[PDB]
Amino acid sequence: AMAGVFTYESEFTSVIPPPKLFKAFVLDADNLIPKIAPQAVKSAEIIEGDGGVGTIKKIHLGEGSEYSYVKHKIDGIDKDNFVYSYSIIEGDAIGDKIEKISYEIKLVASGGGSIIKSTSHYHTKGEVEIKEEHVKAGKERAAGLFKIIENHLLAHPEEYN
Ligand SMILES: Oc1cc(O)c2c(c1)O[C@H](c1ccc(O)c(O)c1)[C@@H](O)C2
């Protein structure tokens, strides 16, 4: 029956500045990734909402994740300060051990690069197993994807200006 929340903090740098990165990784992620990283993600669609806060999206994952869905709940967007927060509410790692996973992502200017500050909140249930390796994975995973994006924009500077 026991509820809890485990909360983890992570950072990535990028040479791409916030406002470009933001448009690519947040605002256009849904079409972009599927185009440049099919193994990551096949497609993404709005199930519910108006696209703003409170929208839910079914995201169709790629082979990397045995073609499994997740549903994302948009918790907030601030297009000015480059903040985005969304919770995974169904899908891959959302079992019994763990019931929602929530992210706040904050892009910070840093020398015409960015630092991507990421807070994740694993909403637990029952006993709490959290392995230094389960965290390293999920972290590598996210960074793998920012790297795909960063390198994509470096090779396509015509995009997201
Ligand atoms: O290989 C994977 C496995 C996953 O569970 C996920 C992956 C990639 O990336 C998905 C992802 C992450 C950020 C996104 O904007 C996105 O559209 C899709 C993430 O929610 C879940």
Author numbering: -1 to 159
Relevant lines from the article:
In the case of Fra a 3, crystals were obtained only in the presence of catechin, a natural flavonoid present in strawberries. The crystallographic model contains five protein chains and six molecules of catechin. All of the molecules of Fra a 3 in the asymmetric unit showed additional density inside the cavity. The catechin molecule inside of the Fra a 3 binding cavity is stabilized both by polar and hydrophobic interactions and shows the same conformation in the five copies within the asymmetric unit. It is stabilized by polar interactions with the side chains of Asp-28, Ser-63, His-70, Tyr-84, and Arg-139 and backbone atoms of residues Gln-37, Ala-38, and Gly-60, whereas the non-polar groups of catechin are surrounded by hydrophobic side chains including Ile-31, Val-39, Leu-59, and Leu-143. In the Fra a 3 structure, the loop L5 wraps around one end of the catechin molecule and approaches the C-terminal α-helix (α3) on the opposite side restricting the access to the cavity. This closed conformation is stabilized by interactions with the catechin molecule.
Fra a proteins are members of the pathogenesis-related 10 family and are required for the normal accumulation of flavonoids and the development of color in strawberry fruits. These proteins adopt a helix-grip fold with an internal cavity capable of binding hydrophobic ligands.
